[PDB]
Amino acid sequence: TVVEFEELRKELVKRDSGKPVEKIKEEICTKSPPKLIKEIICENKTYADVNIDRSRGDWHVILYLMKHGVTDPDKILELLPRDSKAKENEKWNTQKYFVITLSKAWSVVKKYLEA
């Protein structure tokens, strides 16, 4: 288990955008027309403003950033809204659930981008 997380850690930093989040939000907001994922990141609003489930939003938001070319867990995390389950939880459950969503999200996009 632990060794599989270190294998994921090296894979993300190898596929990361290598650019700071302050630059990422510029490319995020000019690479797509109006969209649910764009509404969250380009206006700093929260899931309750778009009336979506916080766990469902965390899925589509995380998979989208990976397709944008950014994959560092600190960049993906920093762009999540206030109501994110990966930002508001029992603290210890925050880090646990974040990796469960991050590891499965990266699994779906990496098999999709290498297709």
Short mmCIF file of C-alpha atoms in Angstrom, two decimals:
data_model
loop_
_atom_site.label_atom_id
_atom_site.label_comp_id
_atom_site.label_asym_id
_atom_site.label_seq_id
_atom_site.Cartn_x
_atom_site.Cartn_y
_atom_site.Cartn_z
CA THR A 1 0.00 0.00 0.00
CA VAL A 2 2.52 2.63 1.14
CA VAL A 3 4.92 1.69 -1.69
CA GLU A 4 2.09 2.18 -4.22
CA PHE A 5 1.59 5.75 -2.97
CA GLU A 6 5.28 6.59 -3.50
CA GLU A 7 4.97 5.17 -7.03
CA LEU A 8 2.03 7.55 -7.57
CA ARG A 9 3.95 10.46 -6.01
CA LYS A 10 6.82 10.13 -8.51
CA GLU A 11 4.38 9.69 -11.41
CA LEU A 12 2.48 12.91 -10.68
CA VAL A 13 5.59 15.11 -10.35
CA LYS A 14 6.87 13.59 -13.62
CA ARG A 15 3.61 14.57 -15.38
CA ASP A 16 3.08 17.90 -13.56
CA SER A 17 2.88 21.25 -15.39
CA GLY A 18 5.99 22.53 -13.55
CA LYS A 19 4.29 25.97 -13.28
CA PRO A 20 2.83 27.77 -10.22
CA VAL A 21 -0.94 27.70 -9.59
CA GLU A 22 -1.12 31.49 -10.12
CA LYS A 23 -0.31 30.79 -13.79
CA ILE A 24 -2.45 27.64 -14.03
CA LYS A 25 -5.70 29.51 -13.31
CA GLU A 26 -5.00 31.76 -16.30
CA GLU A 27 -4.69 28.83 -18.71
CA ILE A 28 -7.68 27.09 -17.08
CA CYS A 29 -9.94 30.08 -17.72
CA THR A 30 -8.85 30.58 -21.37
CA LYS A 31 -8.69 26.93 -22.54
CA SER A 32 -12.45 26.30 -22.33
CA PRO A 33 -15.83 28.01 -22.94
CA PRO A 34 -18.27 28.44 -20.01
CA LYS A 35 -18.40 25.16 -18.07
CA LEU A 36 -19.18 23.86 -14.55
CA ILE A 37 -15.47 23.28 -13.82
CA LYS A 38 -14.63 26.76 -15.17
CA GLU A 39 -17.28 28.39 -12.95
CA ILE A 40 -15.65 26.96 -9.81
CA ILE A 41 -12.00 27.85 -10.53
CA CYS A 42 -12.43 31.15 -12.42
CA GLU A 43 -14.72 32.77 -9.81
CA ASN A 44 -13.42 31.08 -6.62
CA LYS A 45 -17.04 30.11 -5.77
CA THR A 46 -18.11 26.90 -4.00
CA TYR A 47 -20.14 23.76 -4.76
CA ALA A 48 -23.17 25.15 -2.90
CA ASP A 49 -23.26 28.07 -5.37
CA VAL A 50 -23.65 25.65 -8.31
CA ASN A 51 -25.85 23.28 -6.25
CA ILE A 52 -23.70 20.16 -6.79
CA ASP A 53 -22.65 17.32 -4.47
CA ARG A 54 -19.22 17.98 -2.97
CA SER A 55 -17.86 14.47 -3.65
CA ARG A 56 -19.17 14.45 -7.23
CA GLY A 57 -17.69 17.90 -7.85
CA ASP A 58 -14.32 16.81 -6.42
CA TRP A 59 -14.22 13.99 -8.97
CA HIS A 60 -14.88 16.03 -12.14
CA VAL A 61 -12.68 18.90 -10.91
CA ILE A 62 -9.65 16.68 -10.17
CA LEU A 63 -9.84 14.73 -13.45
CA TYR A 64 -10.09 18.00 -15.40
CA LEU A 65 -6.90 19.52 -13.96
CA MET A 66 -4.96 16.38 -14.91
CA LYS A 67 -6.20 16.77 -18.50
CA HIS A 68 -5.07 20.43 -18.36
CA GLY A 69 -1.49 19.15 -17.88
CA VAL A 70 -1.16 19.93 -14.14
CA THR A 71 -1.00 16.98 -11.73
CA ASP A 72 0.91 17.99 -8.58
CA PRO A 73 -1.33 17.15 -5.57
CA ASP A 74 -0.63 20.61 -4.10
CA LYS A 75 -1.82 22.38 -7.27
CA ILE A 76 -4.86 20.12 -7.67
CA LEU A 77 -5.74 20.68 -3.99
CA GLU A 78 -5.24 24.45 -4.06
CA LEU A 79 -7.86 24.81 -6.82
CA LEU A 80 -10.62 22.91 -4.97
CA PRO A 81 -13.55 25.02 -3.65
CA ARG A 82 -14.29 25.73 0.03
CA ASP A 83 -16.94 23.00 0.32
CA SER A 84 -14.56 20.33 -1.04
CA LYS A 85 -14.48 17.09 0.96
CA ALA A 86 -10.70 17.21 0.42
CA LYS A 87 -10.58 20.56 2.30
CA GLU A 88 -13.37 20.29 4.90
CA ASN A 89 -13.42 16.97 6.79
CA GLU A 90 -12.20 15.35 10.06
CA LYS A 91 -8.62 16.54 9.18
CA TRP A 92 -7.18 13.00 9.26
CA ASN A 93 -10.03 11.93 6.98
CA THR A 94 -9.15 14.89 4.72
CA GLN A 95 -5.73 13.51 3.80
CA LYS A 96 -7.06 9.95 3.52
CA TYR A 97 -10.01 10.76 1.24
CA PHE A 98 -7.91 13.13 -0.86
CA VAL A 99 -5.51 10.36 -1.88
CA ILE A 100 -8.38 7.92 -2.55
CA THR A 101 -9.89 10.44 -4.97
CA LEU A 102 -6.54 11.56 -6.39
CA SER A 103 -5.22 8.03 -7.04
CA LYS A 104 -8.43 6.88 -8.76
CA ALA A 105 -8.82 10.14 -10.69
CA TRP A 106 -5.28 9.88 -12.03
CA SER A 107 -5.92 6.23 -12.91
CA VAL A 108 -8.86 7.22 -15.14
CA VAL A 109 -7.14 10.08 -16.96
CA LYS A 110 -3.77 8.34 -17.41
CA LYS A 111 -5.40 5.32 -19.10
CA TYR A 112 -7.45 7.79 -21.18
CA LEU A 113 -4.56 10.05 -22.27
CA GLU A 114 -2.31 7.07 -23.14
CA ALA A 115 -5.10 5.51 -25.25
#
